[PDB]
Design a protein around this motif. Structure first.
Motif, PDB file in Angstrom:
ATOM      1  N   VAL A   1       0.849  -1.185   0.000  1.00 50.14           N
ATOM      2  CA  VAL A   1       0.000   0.000   0.000  1.00 50.14           C
ATOM      3  C   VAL A   1       0.886   1.237   0.000  1.00 50.14           C
ATOM      4  CG1 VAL A   1      -0.173   0.033   2.514  1.00 50.14           C
ATOM      5  CG2 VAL A   1      -1.888   1.216   1.127  1.00 50.14           C
ATOM      6  N   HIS A   2       0.597   2.169  -0.902  1.00 49.81           N
ATOM      7  CA  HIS A   2       1.269   3.461  -0.963  1.00 49.81           C
ATOM      8  C   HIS A   2       0.253   4.543  -0.627  1.00 49.81           C
ATOM      9  CE1 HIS A   2       4.174   6.338  -3.304  1.00 49.81           C
ATOM     10  NE2 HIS A   2       4.295   6.439  -1.993  1.00 49.81           N
ATOM     11  N   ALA A   3       0.521   5.302   0.432  1.00 46.81           N
ATOM     12  CA  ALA A   3      -0.388   6.331   0.918  1.00 46.81           C
ATOM     13  C   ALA A   3       0.228   7.699   0.667  1.00 46.81           C
ATOM     14  CB  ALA A   3      -0.684   6.141   2.405  1.00 46.81           C
ATOM     15  N   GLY A   4      -0.497   8.550  -0.058  1.00 41.06           N
ATOM     16  CA  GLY A   4      -0.024   9.889  -0.333  1.00 41.06           C
ATOM     17  C   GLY A   4      -0.323  10.855   0.799  1.00 41.06           C
ATOM     18  N   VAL A   5       0.258  12.050   0.683  1.00 39.71           N
ATOM     19  CA  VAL A   5       0.027  13.083   1.688  1.00 39.71           C
ATOM     20  C   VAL A   5      -1.435  13.511   1.684  1.00 39.71           C
ATOM     21  CG1 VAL A   5       0.701  15.383   2.455  1.00 39.71           C
ATOM     22  CG2 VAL A   5       2.421  13.828   1.515  1.00 39.71           C
ATOM     23  N   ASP A   6      -2.016  13.696   0.497  1.00 40.84           N
ATOM     24  CA  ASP A   6      -3.405  14.131   0.404  1.00 40.84           C
ATOM     25  C   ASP A   6      -4.383  13.048   0.838  1.00 40.84           C
ATOM     26  OD1 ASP A   6      -3.678  16.815  -0.231  1.00 40.84           O
ATOM     27  OD2 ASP A   6      -3.476  16.498  -2.392  1.00 40.84           O
ATOM     28  N   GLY A   7      -3.951  11.789   0.873  1.00 37.17           N
ATOM     29  CA  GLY A   7      -4.802  10.680   1.256  1.00 37.17           C
ATOM     30  C   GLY A   7      -5.072   9.685   0.148  1.00 37.17           C
TER      31      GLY A   7
ATOM     32  N   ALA B   1      -0.092  -2.227  -5.139  1.00 31.00           N
ATOM     33  CA  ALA B   1       0.575  -3.028  -6.155  1.00 31.00           C
ATOM     34  C   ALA B   1       0.710  -4.460  -5.663  1.00 31.00           C
ATOM     35  CB  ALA B   1       1.957  -2.459  -6.493  1.00 31.00           C
ATOM     36  N   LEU B   2       0.411  -5.410  -6.542  1.00 32.10           N
ATOM     37  CA  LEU B   2       0.492  -6.816  -6.180  1.00 32.10           C
ATOM     38  C   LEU B   2       1.946  -7.250  -6.029  1.00 32.10           C
ATOM     39  CD1 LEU B   2      -2.096  -8.072  -8.820  1.00 32.10           C
ATOM     40  CD2 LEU B   2      -2.567  -7.409  -6.458  1.00 32.10           C
TER      41      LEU B   2
END
Lengths: 154, 464, 67, 67, 67, 66, 154
Positions: free
Chosen positions: A45-51, A56-57
């Protein structure tokens, strides 16, 4: 509401069959026979600053299959000899199969990763061989399949 | 006995096997002469055609419709009646007409290109085939062609292409035939009939109630959705008699015999779940085309309708003639059959070792466990039977069983050796059929809510 | 399960006590079996396989209709 | 006889539902069965997949068990 | 309870003492019974069952009014 | 006398039985001509209506209230 | 209802025969001759929070067979000598058989687990030898077998 029995038959450890190269393994330890674990998480899981969230599998399916045997079991000799045979000839792969009694199963290729330590004491010792697996996806052997097309949503 | 290879493999291209399921075999009372027996069991349409059944014939259509359901059975029972002749009615309009006719293992497909002219041309074409003339006969009249087989020959006629009806006539009455059919085999549950006269349907309905069978019929009538005051259709006829039969209106019910679709959507459904037919999809049926008022009339007459919604097709309301839901009837029949089967199976096993059961307080109570096994517990596990405490009426839904004691048994029963007065109680669950929602939308700033923080009181104290 | 039976003294005829030989000892066994021949049934699919039935009920054992 | 020979009367074990190999199920309908019962002619009937005797009655009307 | 009765010597006629045969021994018994037929009465509920009577008294046996 | 099935079940939908209680039978002196006897005993309003009593009649109201 | 005699013969302790290695044991204690106990429960139970119940069989059949003998009995010497003989040569297993008079029986392999304490006092002492058993399943020797196919249900 009344309590329900989760199964009709009873989970019998003797019914779990392990086939390494086409022969049944015998002479297991006391508490646990085999343990199967995945090396890496399924999904990252990649979480950005904005949300914003993106995932990616993971294509790394390698795993480790612990195998506990009594030091008096004859299968210790087979694995020990096969270790040197593979070291000399260069062939290390061999089929691996596991049959569950009232659970999931496994059928893939594997190899010997590490030889367990040997200890001599008052009581009979134990050896925990580690067997690699090309793919560590536990597959079912039940009536499952008619509901997988139901849980689907979104 | 002798195998030439240690290992052999049969490579079947494309085809796949299917597992063995438990089901109730339906029975379709068709009129023909292809075999002498009163009733036969088939497992595929291939076997039926191999027995001389013409493609597109009523039995073939019923079988192919039944085998296409999501719950289709794996056997189909075909009844047999006498046959006098058959009709091919061209009333209506039609460019190419094809009629499949099989005569004494001989298969042919007559062809033709106002209905009276088409009928006459078809009749002339039939006589052109020397084989048909020698073994069969054809005559034209009005808009229909009547064909009859020469006595030592069997003729089967089935739909090909085009628009027309196929109607078979027989002197044997359903009321006279069914008592003989049931004698050969009682191993079937659903009942269907080819003849669609009012008298035949009424006779089948009367027979089914007496012999504990489920009756199904498609009416293809137009009065089925006439205004509520017009009590002149078969649907209204059955209501007056308080009979039970799952009847539904349709348009192709006399060209395809769509009872097969309903049976295939009902055969392999276990009643223990209480799984109603409300929204089950059925292949083969065609959506109902009437407007809202027609649907209201049909519902008032208890004539079920197949409707298409959001791109799919769906049955509706699963109601029977008497007004009771078919689900309840199936559940009652299931309980009635399986309680009896379980008790008989225990008794037979107990008397097969000696030590047969005896009428005493020390042996009777085991019936409680015997009955709590099989139906009473499977129903609870699968959700069909309800349990728990009711908060409104302050009553419990727990199943109950009562057994009388020896001192209460009259002396006469000890001579007849039969026990009576065993009582059981149950509470049936319910599916969900209709839902109504109340939404709301806000445009401006919503008004500030009340700021009361007290725990809401239950009721006013003022009371005398 | 293998079974073994031995007669009691009261059941031995007097003649055998003179001949000093015992009889009627019984044993039972069940022999295993090897595998000699095997037959397989394969299948191949070319187009898209047809959608399977979507029934989720637990398959019932046998028909209830029986008298 | 094989369903009766080695049955000890002391238990009062009637013949109602005893299964018997060799016999064939009775094929008549309900009215025929009623007539047979009225004449005290016992009939072998098949129910729920098995075969079973019925009612064990004798000619005089008394149950064979009592005799 | 099973009963057995034996006559006394004073009640034996003189003729039997010459014939040397005793008579009039009496025994009684009660035979048990197997179970042949059973009939059941089931019931089904669909809506909410109606509230039962809330009487807590011990049910009386019979009406007192009798003359 | 003759039973065609070893086990039989009557499935009554909805209805339930009630136990037998001890009680004192009331008497309602009504005026009518439906039967010749001076006094009769009924166990349900169904039997009373089956004897020609009109729904809503005094005796019917009394019975259904009792 | 009348009281019933549970057996025709009478339970005779002398009829209980113990065969260790092919010889009958003699010189038993006063109260109890032999006691047989299983080491572990037959079936385990796993109870979930929601109430689901699942069970697994136990394959550990090892047990302990207590054996009481008077300290004056000659069999004390036999077992004592066999203990050292097995310790030196390395062979410890020997057949064990028990015949019940009006009860269950036993026939398996066993070994000496612990030597009982010895105490000398005013009265004759007692020694309670402990003999292991590979399998502690008490088997019947009666007409049982025609009813086991009757109790079966569910």
């Amino acid at each position: 509401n009344q309590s329900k029995i989760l199964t009709l038959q009873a989970y019998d450890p003797a019914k779990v069959l392990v086939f390494i190269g086409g022969q049944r393994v015998s002479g297991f330890a006391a508490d646990t026979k085999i343990v199967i674990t995945r090396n890496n998480d399924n999904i990252s899981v990649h979480a950005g600053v904005d949300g914003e969230i993106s995932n990616a599998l993971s294509r790394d399916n390698t795993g480790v299959m612990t195998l506990s045997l009594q030091n008096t079991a004859k299968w210790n000799g087979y694995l020990a000899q096969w270790q040197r045979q593979a070291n000399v000839t260069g062939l290390i792969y061999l089929p691996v199969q596991v049959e569950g009694s009232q659970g999931l199963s496994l059928n893939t290729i594997g190899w010997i990763q590490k030889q367990p330590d040997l200890s001599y004491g008052t009581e009979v010792g134990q050896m925990d061989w580690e067997i690699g697996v090309l793919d560590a996806w536990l597959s079912p052997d039940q009536i499952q399949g008619i509901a997988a097309g139901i849980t689907g949503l979104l | 006995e002798y195998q030439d290879k240690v290992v052999d493999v049969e490579v079947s291209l494309g085809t796949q096997p299917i597992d063995t399921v438990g089901f109730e075999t339906p029975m379709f009372l068709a009129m023909h002469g292809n075999f002498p027996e009163r009733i036969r069991f088939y497992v595929s349409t291939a076997g039926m055609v191999a027995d001389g059944f013409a493609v597109g014939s009523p039995a073939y259509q019923f079988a192919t419709n039944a085998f296409a359901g999501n719950f289709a059975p794996q056997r189909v029972a075909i009844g047999r009646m006498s046959i006098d002749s058959s009709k091919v009615d061209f009333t209506g309009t039609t460019e190419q007409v094809v009629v499949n006719i099989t005569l004494n293992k001989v298969v042919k497909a007559v062809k033709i290109n106002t209905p009276a002219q088409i009928a006459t041309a078809l009749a002339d074409a039939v006589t052109a085939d020397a084989d048909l003339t020698g073994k069969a006969t054809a005559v034209a009249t009005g808009t229909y062609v009547t064909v009859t087989a020469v006595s030592p020959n069997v003729v089967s006629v089935g739909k090909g292409a085009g628009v027309y009806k196929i109607v078979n006539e027989s002197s044997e009455t359903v009321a006279t035939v069914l008592p003989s059919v049931i004698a050969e085999n009682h191993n079937w549950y659903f009942l269907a009939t080819e003849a669609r006269s009012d008298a035949d349907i009424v006779a089948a309905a009367e027979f089914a109630k007496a012999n504990y069978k489920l009756h199904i019929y498609n009416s293809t009538d137009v009065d089925a959705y006439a205004p509520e005051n017009s009590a002149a259709s078969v649907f209204d006829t059955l209501k007056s008699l308080s009979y039970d039969s799952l009847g539904t209106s349709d348009a192709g019910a006399d060209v395809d015999f769509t009872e097969g679709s309903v049976i295939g959507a009902m055969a392999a459904n276990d009643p223990s779940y209480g799984d109603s037919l409300h929204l089950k999809t059925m292949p083969g049926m065609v959506p109902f085309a009437g407007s809202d008022t027609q649907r209201s009339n049909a519902w008032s007459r208890n004539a079920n309708i197949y409707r298409g919604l959001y791109g799919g097709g769906s049955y509706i309301e699963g109601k029977t003639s008497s007004g009771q839901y078919v689900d309840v009837i199936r559940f009652s029949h299931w309980v009635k059959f399986r309680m009896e089967e379980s008790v008989f199976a225990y008794m037979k096993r107990r008397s097969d070792m000696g030590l047969s059961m005896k009428m005493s307080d020390e042996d009777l109570p085991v019936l409680k466990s015997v009955l709590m096994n099989n139906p009473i517990n499977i129903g609870i596990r699968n959700g069909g039977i309800l349990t728990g405490y009711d908060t409104e009426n302050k009553v419990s839904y727990d199943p109950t069983i009562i057994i009388p004691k020896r001192a209460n048994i009259p002396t006469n029963d000890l001579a007849a050796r039969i026990l009576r007065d065993v009582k059981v109680e149950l509470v049936y669950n319910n599916s969900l059929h209709y839902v109504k929602i109340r939404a709301s939308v806000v445009l401006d700033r919503p008004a500030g809510q009340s700021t009361n923080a007290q725990t809401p009181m239950s009721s006013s104290a003022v009371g005398v």
